[PDB]
Amino acid sequence: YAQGTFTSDYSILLDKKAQAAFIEYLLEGGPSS
Amino acid sequence: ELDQLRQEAEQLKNQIRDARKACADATLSQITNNIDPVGRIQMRTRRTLRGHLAKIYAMHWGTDSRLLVSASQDGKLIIWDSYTTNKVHAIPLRSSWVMTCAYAPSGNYVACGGLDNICSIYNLKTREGNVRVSRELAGHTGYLSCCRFLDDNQIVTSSGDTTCALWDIETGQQTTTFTGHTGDVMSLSLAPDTRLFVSGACDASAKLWDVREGMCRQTFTGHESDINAICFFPNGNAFATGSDDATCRLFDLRADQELMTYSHDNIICGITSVSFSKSGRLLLAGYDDFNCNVWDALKADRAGVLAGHDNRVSCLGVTDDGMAVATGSWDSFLKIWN
Amino acid sequence: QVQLQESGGGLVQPGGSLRLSCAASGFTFSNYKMNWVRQAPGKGLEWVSDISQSGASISYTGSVKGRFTISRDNAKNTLYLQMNSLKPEDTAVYYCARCPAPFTRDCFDVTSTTYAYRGQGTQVTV
Amino acid sequence: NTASIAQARKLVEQLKMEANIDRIKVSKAAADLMAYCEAHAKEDPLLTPVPASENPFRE
Amino acid sequence: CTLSAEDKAAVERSKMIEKQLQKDKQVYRATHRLLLLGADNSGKSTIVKQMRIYRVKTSGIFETKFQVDKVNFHMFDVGAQRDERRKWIQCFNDVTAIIFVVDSSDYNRLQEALNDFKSIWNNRWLRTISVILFLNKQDLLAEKVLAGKSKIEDYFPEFARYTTPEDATPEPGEDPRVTRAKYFIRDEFLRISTASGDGRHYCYPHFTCSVDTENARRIFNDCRDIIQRMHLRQYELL
Amino acid sequence: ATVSLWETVQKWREYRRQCQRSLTEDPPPATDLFCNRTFDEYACWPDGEPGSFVNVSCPWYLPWASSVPQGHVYRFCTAEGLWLQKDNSSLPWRDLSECEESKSPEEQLLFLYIIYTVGYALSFSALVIASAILLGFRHLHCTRNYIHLNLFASFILRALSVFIKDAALKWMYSTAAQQHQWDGLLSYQDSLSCRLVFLLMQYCVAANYYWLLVEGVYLYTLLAFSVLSEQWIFRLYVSIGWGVPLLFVVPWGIVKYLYEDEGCWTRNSNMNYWLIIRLPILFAIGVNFLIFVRVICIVVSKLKANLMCKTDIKCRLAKSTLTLIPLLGTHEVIFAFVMDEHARGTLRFIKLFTELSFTSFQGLMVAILYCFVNNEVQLEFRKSWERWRLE
Ligand SMILES: *C(=O)COCCOCCNC(=O)CC[C@H](NC(=O)CCCCCCCCCCCCCCCCCCC(=O)O)C(=O)O
Known part of the structure; x- marks a missing residue:
């Protein structure tokens, strides 16, 4: 149905940007700051 | 020979009309113009008796003011316990078309009848413990409209064949026959002393009959359409009659004329049932406009309105001791108001 | 009491005209639909014409359509029937019948043998 | 024709029987009705509502 | 809550009575009730006798039960009753349909049938129930038309000029005059029917004879149509 | 991936x-x-x-x-x-520029989020009002009204599950779960509560579809079979509306937990366990569409074979079709036959937008058509107004 599909699109998209921030955090200095 | 008979009949009618006019010194409204008017009485449905399948055509109250009998068009005669909302008995009917039902004063027997032209009396409490068909009466050539028990052995019935009958339960034959009406005897009401009874038919007239002697004591003609609701006043010296012209009339046996008229501009539908309270102050009429009305029998103005009853109201009745009033309509529901 | 009195009968040569008047007493004339009933000798009651409360809706039987006219006078509570071009088959008793219930289009038992709200009728001979 | 004559005769006799019944004036009957209504007014639960602890249909 | 032993017994009896009433409710609501009406010459008695293949001197009403496609129908014929019908006709308010049988063969009485049908159709308590018309004794009408008397024009002037409707489906080997007269009678009934039935009840016509064995099937089909239309109206789909 | x-x-x-x-x-x-x-x-x-x-x-x-x-x-x-x-x-x-990436937008999905959220909220309010109205008036207590109440409850549960699921998605992708460390015990992803929330949403949507199917089946049974019981058929319909969705949503959750737990089951990746919920929904939609076309044919036959007073009946047929579509959910037939892998390009925006908007406003449309503008409901309201206006 459209909502199991919309949720998977939103849930894939947010994991994508969640891992993006984590790479940025490593660039920032990882665990420090 | 017929012409002189007609002339004498019209002369006698004119004499009766002149006598009624002479005896009409004053109206009921003028005498009761100084009494305190009744306030606005509001009734609430204290109990519902949802157990029928088809329209409820008639119902009657027992002498104990606790057990009532209801007749439904699906072929059921149900005894309701008014206080506890319990079903005491459920009698199937051979003919599903039932238009009347009566409760015996002793509570041992119950009456039923309708389009089958047969009055069925069922014994409620037998040695076996089941309600069987105690007696069947088949003498009327028209559909039964109203029946009322006098005792455990005699019953007065009215049919559509312009004939009322008095039946002995044991013998099963007509003890007395009353043939004075013109067409489709609709309702009857027994007097408190059971000596006489009043009857209303579709000929726009009412007649008073003596149970023992068996002749029409008095005849009253004041309506304009079919009479389908009659009830005896508790005092026993008056009664009320309801017609399809959206009108009730109050008649007195000692005046031989209508005392007062209950009608209104808004109401244009007929009246199926009429009943009195314990004191006779409130007159309850079931109009076939999805509602019911309560008037006062002294100044003829609106006093209360009962609503919430789907379809036309068919049967109305106050308890013999004045506890509450039960109303049954074509929606297969019985509502108790106090 | 219901009173319905007819007047206007009598012998008439074929092709004549007549005026039958019905006077009503004991009820509100305007609230009831009116109609005429015909009883031929050796025959039963036959419906002729009907007119509603206000006269907007009027109808006649096929045997008399185009020859007889009906009208109402609610001011005087009268029902009028004008007969034109009478026929020898119209020799019969005419009654004025009132509908049993008011504020209603339909009404049964108009041609009943022992109908209550019906007058004595008038004899018309052609 | 005999049936019509018999019906007319029985109607005539019934009418003459009903026309020979004594009838009181309307005022007396109205006064009696008012007296009956006033006398039993207290014993009318519909007219005068009984207390909520006495009616067997509510409590 | 606390209850007495007598109260418990009364409650148990009431529960048993309610169970019996529920059992009877399915039987009551699975059966269609029909009101059979007609004149003395309409031949409804012959119809009842033919359909029965599926008391006292004042019985007042007669019931016949017939089953079509495992569906029960109870038809009620009125007998031993006075000619007055303004009161007891209100009893048949919840019936499935009114089967009105009219003898179209005999003239000088069709006006009475038309008036009775109009009164039934415009009845306040019959404005919802549908009417199934049985133009009974079609063979007699055909023979009377073929007799050459041609008395239909005398009673009904409207038959002087009347074209056969294009929707007519005459039987093979049928005289056009018979078809024209039959459809004229049908249209006379339909003109009265289509004056106050604002989508509430219909006037399904049928040409029937005293020997037809398909009357039960026609009644079953008409009842099915009525039930389907009622269900569609409840859903506001029609 | x-x-x-x-x-x-x-x-x-x-x-x-x-x-x-x-x-x-x-x-x-x-x-x-x-x-x-x-x-x-x-x-x-x-x-x-x-x-x-x-x-x-x-x-x-x-x-x-x-x-x-x-x-x-x-x-x-x-x-x-x-x-x-x-x-x-x-x-x-x-x-970093050498190894950095060479660069659906969030704005495209935000639109859809707002539209379907407001649609679901309006539908929830309308269906709550409709259920209250149906349960209030005693005269409107038929089995058809009971099926309508069950459908309204299914829609309400679907809307509530959608709200709770988007709230959970916001919780699990936010400043929360900051533990970019060895701590596998995430704030909400490792909790069984989010998985149960997703399972509840799946059950709610399946129940809504199967209650649309139940409504269609009940209408077809009334129009085509007749002479059926009342309590038994209602019990069977309720069991199918509620119990049957538990026969494939619960196994789907069990197999999802057993095989790949992933991120609270929110992402369909295997494309073979998603059929466990997809196929029953498609079957229900197809049966509902068949019932819809059957009822439309019945209505056309009724309009043609009878009602001689009118010939131009296209307006009434169109109104009947537009009223019947929301009840049976036949607007889903316009899509769901294109699958997911066939619309990876400029599509999956029109399809998702139309389907989500229609689903969100379906509850509101059904509540308006079958409760708010229903003739019997308005008649009961008028009767109540008259009763209250006569004191
Ligand atoms: C992609 O980059 C954009 O989409 C990613 C979104 O992730 C998915 C879920 N989140 C959202 O859809 C939108 C963000 C959402 N918003 C909210 O929860 C409401 C907004 C306020 C949330 C923070 C509330 C308090 C937090 C403590 C204060 C920290 C400063 C935050 C400033 C905002 C709050 C005002 C100050 C205060 O109230 O204390 C989400 O956050 O998940």
Whole structure:
């Protein structure tokens, strides 16, 4: 149905940007700051 | 020979009309113009008796003011316990078309009848413990409209064949026959002393009959359409009659004329049932406009309105001791108001 | 009491005209639909014409359509029937019948043998 | 024709029987009705509502 | 809550009575009730006798039960009753349909049938129930038309000029005059029917004879149509 | 595929452990001016001779390593033996651009979120009002009204599950779950509550579809079979509306838990366990469409074979079709036959938009058509108004 599909699109998209921030955090200095 | 008979009949009618006019010194409204008017009485449905399948055509109250009998068009005669909302008995009917039902004063027997032209009396409490068909009466050539028990052995019935009958339960034959009406005897009401009874038919007239002697004591003609609701006043010296012209009339046996008229501009539908309270102050009429009305029998103005009853109201009745009033309509529901 | 009195009968040569008047007493004339009933000798009651409360809706039987006219006078509570071009088959008793219930289009038992709200009728001979 | 004559005769006799019944004036009957209504007014639960602890249909 | 032993017994009896009433409710609501009406010459008695293949001197009403496609129908014929019908006709308010049988063969009485049908159709308590018309004794009408008397024009002037409707489906080997007269009678009934039935009840016509064995099937089909239309109206789909 | 945040952080943890192991085991060069080995949480920089250039490949944990398979990490060592510090700071020269990515938008999905959220809210309010109205008036207590109440409850549960699920999605992708560490016990992803929330949403949507199916089946049974019981058929319909969705939603949840737990089951990846919920919904939609076309044919037959007073009946048929579509949910037939893999391009926006909007406003439309504008409901309201106006 459209909502199991919309949720998977939103849930894939947010994991994508969640891992993006984590790479940025490593660039920032990882665990420090 | 017929012409002189007609002339004498019209002369006698004119004499009766002149006598009624002479005896009409004053109206009921003028005498009761100084009494305190009744306030606005509001009734609430204290109990519902949802157990029928088809329209409820008639119902009657027992002498104990606790057990009532209801007749439904699906072929059921149900005894309701008014206080506890319990079903005491459920009698199937051979003919599903039932238009009347009566409760015996002793509570041992119950009456039923309708389009089958047969009055069925069922014994409620037998040695076996089941309600069987105690007696069947088949003498009327028209559909039964109203029946009322006098005792455990005699019953007065009215049919559509312009004939009322008095039946002995044991013998099963007509003890007395009353043939004075013109067409489709609709309702009857027994007097408190059971000596006489009043009857209303579709000929726009009412007649008073003596149970023992068996002749029409008095005849009253004041309506304009079919009479389908009659009830005896508790005092026993008056009664009320309801017609399809959206009108009730109050008649007195000692005046031989209508005392007062209950009608209104808004109401244009007929009246199926009429009943009195314990004191006779409130007159309850079931109009076939999805509602019911309560008037006062002294100044003829609106006093209360009962609503919430789907379809036309068919049967109305106050308890013999004045506890509450039960109303049954074509929606297969019985509502108790106090 | 219901009173319905007819007047206007009598012998008439074929092709004549007549005026039958019905006077009503004991009820509100305007609230009831009116109609005429015909009883031929050796025959039963036959419906002729009907007119509603206000006269907007009027109808006649096929045997008399185009020859007889009906009208109402609610001011005087009268029902009028004008007969034109009478026929020898119209020799019969005419009654004025009132509908049993008011504020209603339909009404049964108009041609009943022992109908209550019906007058004595008038004899018309052609 | 005999049936019509018999019906007319029985109607005539019934009418003459009903026309020979004594009838009181309307005022007396109205006064009696008012007296009956006033006398039993207290014993009318519909007219005068009984207390909520006495009616067997509510409590 | 606390209850007495007598109260418990009364409650148990009431529960048993309610169970019996529920059992009877399915039987009551699975059966269609029909009101059979007609004149003395309409031949409804012959119809009842033919359909029965599926008391006292004042019985007042007669019931016949017939089953079509495992569906029960109870038809009620009125007998031993006075000619007055303004009161007891209100009893048949919840019936499935009114089967009105009219003898179209005999003239000088069709006006009475038309008036009775109009009164039934415009009845306040019959404005919802549908009417199934049985133009009974079609063979007699055909023979009377073929007799050459041609008395239909005398009673009904409207038959002087009347074209056969294009929707007519005459039987093979049928005289056009018979078809024209039959459809004229049908249209006379339909003109009265289509004056106050604002989508509430219909006037399904049928040409029937005293020997037809398909009357039960026609009644079953008409009842099915009525039930389907009622269900569609409840859903506001029609 | 989708590179999970937990998988990426676990890969980085393994990479940094291996980097520390290598830095501990790597022998230093003999030259005193060598640049000291440094770890800036990104790469395992080895020791370098003074005045040199170092070139290596991207680390393992980078999800876009396929874009830069070999090389693309660079560093420079000065002559004195110190890293080239940046301006007004103490960080080496930046080489992220070589290994960095070459650059559906959130604005496209935000629109859809707003539209379907407001549609679901309006439907929830309307259906609550409709259920209250139906349960209030005693005259409107038929089995058809009971089926309508069950459908309204299914729609309400679907809307509530949608709201709770989007709230949970907001919880699990936010400032929460900040633990980019060895702590696998995430704030909400590791909790069974989110998985149960997703299962509840799946059950609610399946129940809504199957209650649309139940409504269609009941209408078809009334129109085509007749002479059926009342309590037994209602019990069977309720069991099918509620119990049957438990026969494939619960097995779907069980198999999802058993095989791949992933991120609270929110993402369909296997494309073979999604059929467990998809196929029953498609079957229900197809049966409802067949019932819809059957009822439309019945209505056309009724309008043609009878009602001789009218010939131009297209308006009534159109109104009947437009009223019947929301009740049976036949607007889903316009889609769901295109699948997911066939609309990866400019599509999946029109399809998703139309389907989500129609589903969100379906509850409101049904409540308006079958409760608010229903003739019997309005008649009951008028009767109540008259009763209250006569005192
Ligand atoms: C992609 O980059 C954009 O989409 C990613 C969204 O992730 C999915 C879920 N989140 C959202 O859809 C939108 C963000 C959502 N918003 C909210 O929860 C409401 C906004 C306020 C949330 C923070 C509330 C308090 C937090 C403590 C204060 C920290 C400063 C935050 C400033 C905002 C709050 C005002 C200050 C205060 O109230 O203390 C989400 O956050 O998940």
